[PDB]
């Protein structure tokens, strides 16, 4: 378990450094389905989070030993997954809000009008589902890593290497959740099932991106185009 403890700490640190927790942030607040002012802020903040997700990925042990082609394949396939999980860990239930990394705090109607559109209730439902899991940074980070380092994405050159980079992450999460939450013994398969729930939402989100492109005034920001 010293190699496991090192892995958990590395991943916890990588998530923490690239994603402040809800309690650390100073919140601030601000006819047609897409409010272009909210869309502008939302797409800018998402761009910055994609950059932070890349910085998180590079700190995951082994990730940079994959070929560049596969690093890019993995990041593109997990982009919406990780963005959606991240914003869903910034949910305040008593105000029904989500808080972005600059502190911008939007309620459900505003999230709807920023771009989630018909996917708003689905995404807010998923955030509500995460709350009873009481995930800490190590757990959110490991779930993010497990979701990113997935050997079944299309067009991977070395999928077996990706699976073998993922298996230490799964074992770390299994061990960690046992030593943290012995009264919560089905918690590991419960959190892995959220990844599967998350893939379903992100598949619908990829559909929504096509409609958004037809609706926004100009172009998607360049990095978002690359990722999506």
């Amino acid at each position: 378990t010293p190699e496991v403890g090192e892995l958990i700490e590395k991943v916890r640190k990588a998530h923490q450094e690239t994603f402040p927790a809800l309690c650390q942030l100073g919140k601030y607040t601000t006819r047609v389905s897409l409010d272009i002012d909210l869309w502008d802020k939302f797409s800018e903040l998402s761009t910055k989070c994609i950059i932070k997700t890349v910085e998180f990925a590079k700190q995951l042990p082994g990730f940079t030993t994959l070929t560049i082609a596969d690093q890019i394949t993995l990041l593109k396939a997990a982009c919406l997954d990780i963005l959606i999980l991240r914003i869903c860990t910034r949910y305040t239930p008593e105000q029904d809000t989500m808080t972005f990394s600059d502190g911008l705090t939007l309620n459900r109607t505003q999230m709807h009008h920023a771009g989630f559109g018909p996917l708003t209730d689905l995404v807010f439902a998923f955030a509500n589902q995460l709350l009873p899991l009481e995930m800490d940074d190590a757990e959110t980070g490991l779930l993010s890593a497990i979701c990113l380092i997935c050997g079944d994405r299309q067009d991977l050159e070395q999928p077996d290497r990706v699976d073998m980079l993922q298996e230490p992450l799964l074992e770390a999460l299994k061990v960690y959740v046992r030593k943290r939450r012995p009264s919560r013994p089905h918690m590991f398969p419960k959190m892995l099932m959220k990844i599967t729930d998350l893939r379903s939402i992100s598949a619908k989100g990829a559909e929504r991106v096509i409609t958004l492109k037809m609706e926004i005034p100009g172009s998607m920001p360049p990095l978002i185009q690359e990722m999506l």
């Binding site: 950059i51 890349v54 910085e55 590079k58 940079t64 560049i68 890019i72 690359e226």
Partner: peptide
């Protein structure tokens, strides 16, 4: 994927 290469290297 120009920006993404830069970010990774």
């Amino acid at each position: 994927h120009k920006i993404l290469h830069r970010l990774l290297q």
